[PDB]
Design an enzyme around this catalytic site. Structure first.
Site, PDB file in Angstrom:
ATOM      1  N   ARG A 295       0.694  -1.354  -0.415  1.00 53.84           N
ATOM      2  CA  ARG A 295       0.134   0.024   0.108  1.00 53.84           C
ATOM      3  C   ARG A 295       1.032   1.023  -0.154  1.00 53.84           C
ATOM      4  O   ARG A 295       1.537   1.405   0.784  1.00 53.84           O
ATOM      5  CB  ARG A 295      -1.103   0.209   1.366  1.00 53.84           C
ATOM      6  CG  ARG A 295      -1.726  -0.686   1.007  1.00 53.84           C
ATOM      7  CD  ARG A 295      -3.197  -0.141   0.294  1.00 53.84           C
ATOM      8  NE  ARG A 295      -3.006   1.328  -0.335  1.00 53.84           N
ATOM      9  CZ  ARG A 295      -3.420   2.072   1.560  1.00 53.84           C
ATOM     10  NH1 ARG A 295      -4.144   1.318   2.398  1.00 53.84           N
ATOM     11  NH2 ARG A 295      -3.556   3.509   1.527  1.00 53.84           N
TER      12      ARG A 295
ATOM     13  N   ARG B 117       3.862   4.891 -16.556  1.00 54.46           N
ATOM     14  CA  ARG B 117       4.233   5.402 -18.162  1.00 54.46           C
ATOM     15  C   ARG B 117       5.448   5.582 -17.934  1.00 54.46           C
ATOM     16  O   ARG B 117       6.006   6.083 -19.128  1.00 54.46           O
ATOM     17  CB  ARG B 117       3.152   6.478 -19.137  1.00 54.46           C
ATOM     18  CG  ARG B 117       2.222   5.700 -19.082  1.00 54.46           C
ATOM     19  CD  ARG B 117       1.490   7.200 -20.375  1.00 54.46           C
ATOM     20  NE  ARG B 117      -0.040   6.484 -20.600  1.00 54.46           N
ATOM     21  CZ  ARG B 117      -1.035   7.278 -21.630  1.00 54.46           C
ATOM     22  NH1 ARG B 117      -0.233   8.402 -21.864  1.00 54.46           N
ATOM     23  NH2 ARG B 117      -2.094   6.624 -21.256  1.00 54.46           N
TER      24      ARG B 117
ATOM     25  N   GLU C 269     -12.376   6.348  -4.218  1.00 54.03           N
ATOM     26  CA  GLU C 269     -12.607   6.508  -3.026  1.00 54.03           C
ATOM     27  C   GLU C 269     -13.653   6.436  -2.426  1.00 54.03           C
ATOM     28  O   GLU C 269     -14.295   7.820  -3.490  1.00 54.03           O
ATOM     29  CB  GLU C 269     -11.353   6.643  -2.159  1.00 54.03           C
ATOM     30  CG  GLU C 269     -11.079   6.717  -1.313  1.00 54.03           C
ATOM     31  CD  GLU C 269     -10.854   5.295  -0.398  1.00 54.03           C
ATOM     32  OE1 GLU C 269     -11.487   4.748  -0.075  1.00 54.03           O
ATOM     33  OE2 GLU C 269      -9.514   4.925   0.420  1.00 54.03           O
TER      34      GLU C 269
ATOM     35  N   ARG D 105      -4.311   6.596  -3.649  1.00 51.47           N
ATOM     36  CA  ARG D 105      -3.903   5.316  -2.739  1.00 51.47           C
ATOM     37  C   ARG D 105      -3.787   4.698  -3.290  1.00 51.47           C
ATOM     38  O   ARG D 105      -3.689   4.353  -4.576  1.00 51.47           O
ATOM     39  CB  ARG D 105      -4.774   4.501  -1.706  1.00 51.47           C
ATOM     40  CG  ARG D 105      -5.289   6.284  -0.735  1.00 51.47           C
ATOM     41  CD  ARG D 105      -6.840   5.529   0.020  1.00 51.47           C
ATOM     42  NE  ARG D 105      -7.121   6.407   0.916  1.00 51.47           N
ATOM     43  CZ  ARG D 105      -7.207   6.891   1.941  1.00 51.47           C
ATOM     44  NH1 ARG D 105      -7.932   7.393   0.837  1.00 51.47           N
ATOM     45  NH2 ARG D 105      -7.663   7.687   2.456  1.00 51.47           N
TER      46      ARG D 105
ATOM     47  N   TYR E 245       3.567   5.991   2.951  1.00 55.98           N
ATOM     48  CA  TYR E 245       2.600   7.385   3.134  1.00 55.98           C
ATOM     49  C   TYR E 245       3.662   8.756   3.082  1.00 55.98           C
ATOM     50  O   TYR E 245       4.826   8.273   4.494  1.00 55.98           O
ATOM     51  CB  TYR E 245       1.954   6.522   5.176  1.00 55.98           C
ATOM     52  CG  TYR E 245       1.061   5.056   4.969  1.00 55.98           C
ATOM     53  CD1 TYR E 245       0.197   6.207   4.129  1.00 55.98           C
ATOM     54  CD2 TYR E 245       2.005   4.616   4.951  1.00 55.98           C
ATOM     55  CE1 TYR E 245      -0.722   4.395   4.244  1.00 55.98           C
ATOM     56  CE2 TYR E 245       1.617   3.007   4.974  1.00 55.98           C
ATOM     57  CZ  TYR E 245      -0.150   3.197   4.502  1.00 55.98           C
ATOM     58  OH  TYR E 245      -1.004   2.299   4.420  1.00 55.98           O
TER      59      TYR E 245
ATOM     60  N   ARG F  20      -0.764   5.499   8.333  1.00 56.00           N
ATOM     61  CA  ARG F  20       0.043   3.775   7.746  1.00 56.00           C
ATOM     62  C   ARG F  20      -0.409   2.615   8.816  1.00 56.00           C
ATOM     63  O   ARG F  20      -1.454   3.444  10.008  1.00 56.00           O
ATOM     64  CB  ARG F  20       1.609   3.954   8.815  1.00 56.00           C
ATOM     65  CG  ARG F  20       1.652   4.714   9.267  1.00 56.00           C
ATOM     66  CD  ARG F  20       3.853   5.035  10.171  1.00 56.00           C
ATOM     67  NE  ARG F  20       4.293   3.306  10.285  1.00 56.00           N
ATOM     68  CZ  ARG F  20       5.297   2.758  10.742  1.00 56.00           C
ATOM     69  NH1 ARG F  20       5.768   4.146  10.826  1.00 56.00           N
ATOM     70  NH2 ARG F  20       5.352   1.822  10.545  1.00 56.00           N
TER      71      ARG F  20
END
Lengths: 120, 117, 119
Positions: free
Chosen positions: C7, C63, C78, C90, C108, C116
């Protein structure tokens, strides 16, 4: 025993159940054929739709696929990006496959041809 | 080993942190128990909620599962489908398991019993 | 061989393309460096953004990474949580890695530092 994400993208001409299901079916059929996907080797599928699609969950199209009854699928809203392709359905299918990463067949149909990487 | 997605769905009667977390916890508990899921075997979890849920990230329910602190989870907004279930929370947990595809136990609770195939 | 999600989260100061792309690139770079991620081991990536970001798909930032052109990536919206962080991007990168779950380095940055897990 490796796993790979397989992407697809397509569009609908209007937000109706018949069109959403038929276009999602056609996209899934192309992903499945080109990658020789056995449903039993599919970990899960994610399907996004832009926020102008409300008629039906695209995931319902999977009911039309013999042998796919136990493949988990769920949906999510795609971002609303200025200039983003409207009426767009995108698939991310996670498959157990030994194919080299660069040799996976990602599928772009209908107006989503315009999202194909080489055309950017 | 093979890997498998496990689905769940549940609903809440109102958009409160208490109800969202309680129902998400109960759904995760059922998935975990029925499939004997150990956290170290969980690749990741996705949790969606319908756009009538603003109270809390459902991911916060993982704080109630000792040993799950490092299981990655992230959320997403579910489509707004006309006639779709309101106040609905859906889980897709990816787990290392050799259980056959047809034997994985997906879980549908509360008003989401209507969504079970 | 095991698979693990990694994450990340970061924030933007404004909803403009170059800001969104640079912040997303910086977050991806940190995930990749800290976890020594070989692109060939990445199954797929999801990137979410809060509902206040409309300028560009954050996924376009990938890219910019030599060697990453075959990694599948897609985006989603989200949830809009009262008290949640605004202008937030995220990442969930699914990697083939045997690293122990507690040893994965989730990242984070910017205004997202307090998100976190062990906090």
């Amino acid at each position: 025993m490796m796993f790979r994400g397989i992407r697809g993208a397509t569009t609908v001409t209007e937000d109706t159940e018949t069109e959403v299901l038929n276009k999602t079916k056609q996209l899934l059929e192309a992903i499945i054929s080109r990658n020789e996907v056995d449903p039993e080797r599919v970990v899960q599928i994610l399907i996004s739709a832009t926020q102008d699609i409300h008629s039906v969950f695209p995931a319902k199209a999977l009911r039309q696929f013999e042998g796919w009854t136990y493949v988990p699928v769920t949906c999510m809203q795609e971002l609303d990006i200025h200039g983003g392709l409207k009426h767009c359905i995108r698939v991310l299918m996670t498959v157990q496959t030994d194919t080299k990463q660069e040799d996976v067949q990602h599928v772009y149909l209908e107006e989503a041809v315009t999202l194909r990487p080489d055309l950017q």
